[PDB]
Write a protein that binds this DNA or RNA. Structure first.
Lengths: 151, 112, 77, 91, 53
RNA sequence: AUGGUGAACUAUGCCUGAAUAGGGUGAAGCCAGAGGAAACUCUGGUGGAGGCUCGUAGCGGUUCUGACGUGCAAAUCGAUC
RNA sequence: UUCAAAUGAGAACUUUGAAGACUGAAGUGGGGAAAGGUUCCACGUCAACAGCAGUUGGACGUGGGUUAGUCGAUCCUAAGAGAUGGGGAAGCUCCGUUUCAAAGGCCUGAUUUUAUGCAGGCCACCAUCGAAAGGGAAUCCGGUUAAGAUUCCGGAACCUGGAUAUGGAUUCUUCACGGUAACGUAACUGAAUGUGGAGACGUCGGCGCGAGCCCUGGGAGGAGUUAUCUUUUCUUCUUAACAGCUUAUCACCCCGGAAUUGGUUUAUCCGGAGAUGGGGUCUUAUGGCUGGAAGAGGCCAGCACCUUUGCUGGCUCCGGUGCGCUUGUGACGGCCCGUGAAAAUCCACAGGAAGGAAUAGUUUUCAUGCCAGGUCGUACUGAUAACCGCAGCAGGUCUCCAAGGUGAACAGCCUCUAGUUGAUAGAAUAAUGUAGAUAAGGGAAGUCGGCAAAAUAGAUCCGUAACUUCGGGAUAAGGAUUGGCUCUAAGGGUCGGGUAGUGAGGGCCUUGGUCAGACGCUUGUUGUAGACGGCCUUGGUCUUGCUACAAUUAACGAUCAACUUAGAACUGGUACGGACAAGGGGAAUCUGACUGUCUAAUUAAAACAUAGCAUUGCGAUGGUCAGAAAGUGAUGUUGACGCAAU
């Protein structure tokens, strides 16, 4: 039911001796075995997740947090991204351009993962058959087929 | 040609109901139930099947002797040779570079 | 069960203090492309297995059948 | 011998689904099922499995990419934007 | 015939590609086709030895 | 109107399994050959795609407005589908 | 359907025997799931039911019958249900079920009133239910009842829980060796914690291999025909669970190094990230020999037992082929804006706690020995008489096995095994009917409408237009052949590339015996073979390393068993897809693009649906929708390439 590939990233628990698996939306350009870095001091490369306040002008990111700790709400679909269009150091805000063109200002502390999401350009292929629609919608929800209300 | 029938009470053919017909000594064709096929153990790193380890159903592994459950290598019945071989390389070389990282740091900061 | 083909060890399991009965079987079988011979089988019933010792030459049968202990109940033929 | 004149792979749909829809479908399936070079081993062994997952048959190195292309053109400049934006931090 | 020793390794590959295709119809059709290939190869080989001398 | 029962039939979704002879057509991809200076184009093989097709098992039922129509049947039987 | 006999007061129907047929193995045959509940089997019996009858019964009265450590339920969890802590609700109760709950047991040590407390190391999962075709620890064969069996008898196994030793390995290099390596050797310490594998798994297509069955040669028996012929026809010739040795693709390892690129599948993938080649390792599906096990089953000859029954006995053997059907498996390839389940459980690795030597301590995931495996189901039908349709009602109900021939074929048609011969009957057999048919000449003139029937209708060769979304239309339209006998040609597999001396002629038979040359035909009498066979020969006893001629071409020679295709003569009162089987075709017009779906019981449609196109709302302290509230929810395990409304 998702057109974007997932990623299973393992983060070593620092508090206790064990491993924690994490499910990340695979940003296009990431590969298995890549070192995905999370935190303030992370470098600027595709795949890493950083707060918006730590990145300079012109960067596009994805899976950003509406609030500092919901672990990502915005720009999660395939091929979507949000652009950094200015910082607000006063009262620690940052405003960005959503994929729908809406401009929203959020906290500079909320995190976001660098890079666009893989699976873009998916809807450029015509869906052709009814069964292809049936196969697509058999795993998403019961929202197909649609019957006109006039009939 | 003689024709056979099920011996259990399930009348449907599935993976758990596989049937092989055998020539019984009494001169009649009898259906013989076959257990599901075993799958080769797989390496944890490369995913491929690892050689030297007996293949059998999970619960029945508790009966086979250790000679078919442990090769004489490190990471015996979990990893397969080449994965272990480069695991040594990765461990040895990174620790080798780590002290190289340390010695340069002690020199640059001292001359700072 | 299984089959063992060593004479010396076979006597050891006869008085192994768990065998109660034993049987001897005679078969008239063929060989190669020549005349047949006299073939015999010696069977020993253990507690959980049934050992056996096949001998295709009656020459070795004599010294072995006498070697069976008298306390062993043998079902002749 | 060029068995079919102009429809190639999309000719399997017979005569249905119009001409442009088949043609537009035709364009994508050419590179969807094509063979790409790998960035880790440099072989013609990159094929698409699942929606947007590109795997290499040799060395098992899977690269995330577009739904129908290893590197979609709309995001090839995204890393160019980031890489051009990285050096200003240092110099 | 590759392991027979009479033929070379390279001429194997040429016929193998063609046998996957056509112009080789049956067992007999191949055998003299192989022969004339060796016969042709022997033709210039004999002529090359005398031409150099 | 009040209060209870019903998806064993059928309506829809999910989980779990099960079933679908035999032929026709012939897509990519591939191989060989030919043409030409190139671009590239034709010939001959494989290849099995294709919510394709003729057609049994199965699912519905178009027509005879056949049979029956106080019936074998509160809607079934036969042929043609 | 018919004949005869038996029983019976009472036979078109009961039984038996003899014929004639049918289902034709996608059964009118064998077993089951749900359902039924004793219909199962025996005795006796006909007032009632079996729309005729009936001494017959799925009926009546009386009784018998279902045996489990291994087959299942038991256990796990899926979609989902639901109890606590909580929050609503006057309330019956509703929400959620890990969320605003301080929600648990657990190994080491203490021991010697410590019973088990206590002092530390600890881990935190976080009710329960929920799929006798989802996962699941372990068994088969022979035989035996009136009715039971993978359950009973006999024989032969394996698994789990527990207790204890015996034997082996280990060790003063105290917790093993070998191989360069993939890894191996029956055993060959080891906790908390962490990690990994199995369970665990899409569909389709072709290919390889295995099993069951089909076809068939030799031989050992029986039965059938025999006016004539047929080394003829049919039939038996079988081997289980479990165990030892051994065996494959795939994959990996050592040497080596590549263009004059080479290996290679039906299907073009692979190779300096290292091929081809040479040599090895591994999983053991499967298969082979052996044990079980030939004393078992089967086919045959003599013995005589009103009987209860057996004994003596023989064989139960050696093969071959295949696009053969069913099925299993392996390496693959195609498909996707579908990439195609979870947990219990089991094992392994990292780690190093803890303990340990030889006067012996471990080793009970090495071999052997001892004990136990509780409860519940097991009979029968499973269908035009055992289930549901008021009935024994042509209706409906899930699934495994499935032979021979013609034939593409699980099509139609006939038959072998098996099972029925059952559904009221007798005589003439008027109209009118129901179901099959045939009609001289014309031919749709009939009718609202060629509605119903009819014609072509299989296969091979030739040939095929308008238009088009270039894929189709298109087996378009339209032509030529088809039987039988005797031939011709083509399409493969497996082996062999020499002579003279030499070594083994690892069969060395042969002449002598040496001595295991022995059993077999209660000691001995003395009688027999030595199983004519280990051990050495003076030897005539079709594979060869060495040299020679010169070794090569032409390529040859020997065996084997399949069908497919094409062609040539002859032949038949010109018949040949001879029965069955099986497309009418073309010019157009209205309309829906197509596949698909609905008014299950009068409308299958140009109606709905479908892809495509466009618009609208929504950046979650949200958009749409539910609830009586809620600390409630659906989208949402979601994020603008998304959800929702059109």
């Amino acid at each position: 039911g998702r057109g974007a590939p997932l990623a299973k990233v393992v983060f070593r628990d620092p508090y206790k001796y064990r491993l924690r698996e994490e499910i990340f939306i695979a940003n296009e350009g990431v590969h298995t075995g890549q070192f995905i870095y999370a935190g303030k001091k992370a470098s600027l490369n595709v795949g890493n997740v950083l707060p918006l306040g730590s990145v300079p002008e012109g960067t596009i990111v994805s899976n950003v947090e509406e609030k500092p700790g919901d672990r990502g709400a915005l720009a999660r679909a395939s091929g979507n991204y949000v652009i950094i269009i200015g910082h607000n150091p006063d009262e620690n805000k940052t405003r960005v351009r959503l994929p729908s063109g809406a401009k929203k200002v959020i906290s500079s502390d909320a995190r976001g993962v660098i890079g666009v999401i893989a699976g873009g350009g998916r809807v450029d292929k015509p869906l052709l058959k009814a069964g292809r629609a049936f196969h697509k919608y058999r795993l998403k929800r019961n929202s197909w087929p649609k019957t006109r209300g006039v009939a | 040609a003689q024709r056979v029938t099920f011996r259990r009470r399930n009348p449907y053919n599935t993976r758990s109901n596989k049937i092989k017909v055998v020539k019984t000594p009494g001169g009649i064709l009898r259906a013989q139930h076959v257990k599901k096929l075993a799958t080769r153990p797989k390496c944890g790193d490369c995913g491929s099947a690892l050689q030297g380890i007996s293949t059998l159903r999970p619960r029945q592994y508790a009966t086979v002797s250790k000679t078919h459950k442990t090769v004489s290598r490190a990471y015996g019945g979990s990893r397969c040779a080449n994965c272990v071989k480069e695991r040594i390389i990765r461990a040895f070389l990174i620790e080798e570079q780590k002290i190289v990282k340390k010695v340069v740091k002690e020199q640059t900061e001292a001359a700072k | 069960a299984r089959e063992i083909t060593d004479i010396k060890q076979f006597l050891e399991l006869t008085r192994r203090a768990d065998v109660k009965t034993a049987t001897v079987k005679i078969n008239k079988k063929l060989n190669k492309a020549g005349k047949p011979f006299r073939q015999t089988k010696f069977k020993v019933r253990g507690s959980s297995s049934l050992y056996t010792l096949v001998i295709n030459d009656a020459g070795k049968a004599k010294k072995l059948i006498q070697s069976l202990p008298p306390t062993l109940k043998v079902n002749r033929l | 011998a060029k068995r079919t004149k102009k429809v190639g792979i999309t000719g399997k749909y017979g005569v249905r689904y119009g001409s442009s829809l088949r043609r537009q479908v035709k364009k994508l399936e050419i590179q969807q099922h094509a063979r790409y070079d790998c960035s880790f081993c440099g072989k013609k062994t990159v094929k698409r499995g699942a929606a947007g997952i590109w795997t290499c048959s040799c060395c098992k190195k899977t690269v995330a990419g577009g739904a129908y292309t290893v590197s979609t053109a709309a995001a090839a400049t995204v890393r160019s934007t980031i890489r051009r934006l990285r050096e200003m931090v240092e110099a | 015939y590759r392991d027979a020793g009479k033929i070379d390794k390279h001429l194997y590959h040429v016929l193998y590609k063609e046998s996957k295709g056509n112009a080789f119809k049956h067992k007999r059709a191949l055998v003299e086709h192989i022969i004339q290939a060796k016969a042709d190869a022997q033709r210039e080989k004999a002529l090359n030895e005398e031409a150099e001398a």
